[PDB]
Design an enzyme around this catalytic site. Structure first.
Site, PDB file in Angstrom:
ATOM      1  CE  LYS A 184      -1.826  -8.007  -5.714  1.00 16.27           C
ATOM      2  NZ  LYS A 184      -0.672  -7.756  -4.782  1.00 16.27           N
TER       3      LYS A 184
ATOM      4  CD  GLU B 133       1.903  -5.343  -6.533  1.00 19.73           C
ATOM      5  OE1 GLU B 133       2.681  -6.330  -6.545  1.00 19.73           O
ATOM      6  OE2 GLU B 133       0.775  -5.379  -5.978  1.00 19.73           O
TER       7      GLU B 133
ATOM      8  CB  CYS C 271       2.074  -9.157  -7.406  1.00 19.33           C
ATOM      9  SG  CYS C 271       3.596  -9.497  -6.479  1.00 19.33           S
TER      10      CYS C 271
HETATM   11  O1  LIG Z   1       1.840  -9.101  -4.574  1.00 22.85           O
HETATM   12  C1  LIG Z   1       2.582  -9.184  -3.663  1.00 22.85           C
HETATM   13  C2  LIG Z   1       3.391 -10.526  -3.343  1.00 22.85           C
HETATM   14  C3  LIG Z   1       4.737 -10.493  -2.815  1.00 22.85           C
HETATM   15  N1  LIG Z   1       5.236 -11.970  -2.645  1.00 22.85           N
HETATM   16  C4  LIG Z   1       4.199 -12.838  -3.039  1.00 22.85           C
HETATM   17  N2  LIG Z   1       4.312 -14.294  -2.999  1.00 22.85           N
HETATM   18  C5  LIG Z   1       3.624 -15.214  -3.724  1.00 22.85           C
HETATM   19  C6  LIG Z   1       4.128 -16.644  -3.231  1.00 22.85           C
HETATM   20  C7  LIG Z   1       4.736 -16.316  -1.806  1.00 22.85           C
HETATM   21  O2  LIG Z   1       3.718 -16.149  -0.790  1.00 22.85           O
HETATM   22  C8  LIG Z   1       5.365 -15.132  -2.037  1.00 22.85           C
HETATM   23  S1  LIG Z   1       2.969 -11.980  -3.504  1.00 22.85           S
HETATM   24  N3  LIG Z   1       2.785  -8.009  -2.874  1.00 22.85           N
HETATM   25  C9  LIG Z   1       2.097  -6.628  -3.040  1.00 22.85           C
HETATM   26  C10 LIG Z   1       2.116  -6.139  -1.775  1.00 22.85           C
HETATM   27  C11 LIG Z   1       3.553  -6.605  -1.206  1.00 22.85           C
HETATM   28  C12 LIG Z   1       3.168  -6.861   0.204  1.00 22.85           C
HETATM   29  C13 LIG Z   1       4.279  -7.588   0.943  1.00 22.85           C
HETATM   30  O3  LIG Z   1       5.335  -6.575   1.158  1.00 22.85           O
HETATM   31  C14 LIG Z   1       5.646  -5.744  -0.002  1.00 22.85           C
HETATM   32  C15 LIG Z   1       4.843  -5.930  -1.311  1.00 22.85           C
HETATM   33  C16 LIG Z   1       3.670  -7.892  -1.607  1.00 22.85           C
END
Ligand SMILES: O=C(c1cnc(N2CC[C@H](O)C2)s1)N1CCC2(CCOCC2)C1
Length: 462
Positions: A157, A58, A190
């Protein structure tokens, strides 16, 4: 065909230079092309090894540091796949689709399914009652191109993580699948893996054999390390799983893998270097599922293995578990909170003195960076000897276990079995789940245990 070559790439992504105002479309394409060069190196390597499908991470192509306007120059208007379009062969059918074109060509010239994550833009008029004030939707979008380079799936998403203010949420959840000679595939992104839609609908209603999973996951020990929770999810849901993660140790981004219903087949975790890594593994097109598990059957069949414990509260990911400290080198312990009771039996390879383990029970609503109801039973290594650190991120351990057995009176059937070893290593084939809901060791652990956890989701209670 009964089996297929799966590939996943962990991508050390090139992030766009910091600028105050949005860049031109040419600069945007130049940076995305810098990322696509590396991704193409991976795709070509996988094709030369006979891969049928490769997943990439992603945000792998343009990064994650965006507001709406600075992201806009990176977006393309991605059609619905029903338009029956191979960008490689009919470029110029829709206009300004170079990234789709290059992905199509990578899929076609290398005769391999390509799953990538890019940005969709969808113009809207005031005619639309939910058109954003700045005149368009912007979506975090997975695209799949088949081995001919056809656009066969587009997924926006559904469950945005915090810090994703550049994106909009679809009006309704998108259940997106594509069918192949090596199985039926579902797709989500994600954070989606922690929620019901589309992730659980894909398995329960549409019966996909394999999930493709671009992710930019920041590891949160002890239960939400990327490899740990993704392989646990594939095991509980009973599907193959292709997790393609960003490589960015600075933000705890690492952990990619290929997982099967019966075990992890390949995984990668690297905090030390900045290199990407291509993983390949054989998978069955249509796996077997053993008998489904009643996750509360056994646990509801015992009385408490221990009584009059010294219980205490200790914080795991801003959730307050009820813990009992493990004192003997071996023991039978029970711990309860509200509706959930957790049973553990265990024999350690040795009593390491300055290492403290605890058994904890949680039954409640998580609210910090995500709202979701949880029922968790966990054996875990406390960060330090201070009982106040039981629940804190612990990366290393020395205590191996000769045997363990964990179960719980779960009020849900969505429970994901986790076993993590010191240094964030999976334990493929070292444990099993019984039909009455016990996660137990098939032999002494090969390395010291960080956690043995039953992670259950109560989606109705969100
Ligand atoms: O999909 C995600 C997740 C990243 N870590 C996640 N989890 C789930 C359990 C705990 O909360 C940790 S979800 N993304 C996309 C956007 C992103 C935003 C933050 O900075 C860079 C990338 C993060």
């Amino acid at each position: 065909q009964d089996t297929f070559i799966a590939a996943v790439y962990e991508h050390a992504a090139i992030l766009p230079n910091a600028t105050l105002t949005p860049v031109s479309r040419e600069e945007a394409l130049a940076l995305m092309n810098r990322n696509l060069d590396i991704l193409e190196g991976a795709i070509t390597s996988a094709a030369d090894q006979g891969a049928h499908i490769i997943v990439t991470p992603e945000d792998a192509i343009y990064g994650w540091n965006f507001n709406r306007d600075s992201l806009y120059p990176y977006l393309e208007d991605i059609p619905d796949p029903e338009v029956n379009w191979i960008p490689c062969n009919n470029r110029n059918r829709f206009g300004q689709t170079p990234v789709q074109e290059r992905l199509s060509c990578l899929a076609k010239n290398n005769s391999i399914y390509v799953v990538a994550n890019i940005g969709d833009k969808k113009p809207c008029d005031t005619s639309d009652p939910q058109c954003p004030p700045d005149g368009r939707y912007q979506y975090n979008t997975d695209v799949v191109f088949d081995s001919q380079g056809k656009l066969v799936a587009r997924y926006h998403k559904q469950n945005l993580f915090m810090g994703e203010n550049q994106f909009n949420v679809p009006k309704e959840p998108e259940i997106v699948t594509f069918n192949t000679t090596f199985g039926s595939f579902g797709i989500f992104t994600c954070f989606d893996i922690l929620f019901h839609d589309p992730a659980v609908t894909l398995v329960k209603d549409f019966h996909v054999d394999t999930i493709v999973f671009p992710t930019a996951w920041m590891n949160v020990l002890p239960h939400l390390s990327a490899v740990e929770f993704h392989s646990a999810w594939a095991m509980g849901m009973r599907v193959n799983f292709l997790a393609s993660n960003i490589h960015y140790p600075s933000k705890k981004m690492t952990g990619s893998g290929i997982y099967a219903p019966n075990s992890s087949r390949a995984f990668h975790y690297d905090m030390k270097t900045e290199e990407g890594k291509l993983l390949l593994s054989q998978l069955d097109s249509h796996p077997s599922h053993s008998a489904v598990v009643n996750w509360t059957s056994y646990a509801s069949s015992i009385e408490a293995l221990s009584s009059g414990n010294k219980e205490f509260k200790g914080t795991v990911f801003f959730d307050e578990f009820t813990f009992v400290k493990l004192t003997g080198v071996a023991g039978n312990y029970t711990v309860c909170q509200k509706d959930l009771c957790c049973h553990l039996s265990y024999k350690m390879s040795e009593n390491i003195p300055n290492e403290v383990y605890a058994l904890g029970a949680f039954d409640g609503l998580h609210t910090v960076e995500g709202r979701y109801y949880l029922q968790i039973c966990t054996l875990l290594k406390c960060k330090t000897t201070n009982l106040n650190t039981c629940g804190d991120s612990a990366e290393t351990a020395s205590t191996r276990f000769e045997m363990f057995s964990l179960s719980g009176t779960f009020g849900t059937q969505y429970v994901f079995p986790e076993v993590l070893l010191s240094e964030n290593q999976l334990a493929p084939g070292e444990f099993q789940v019984s039909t009455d809901g016990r996660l137990f060791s098939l032999k002494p652990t090969s390395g010291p245990v960080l956690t043995v956890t039953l992670f259950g989701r109560l989606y109705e209670k969100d």
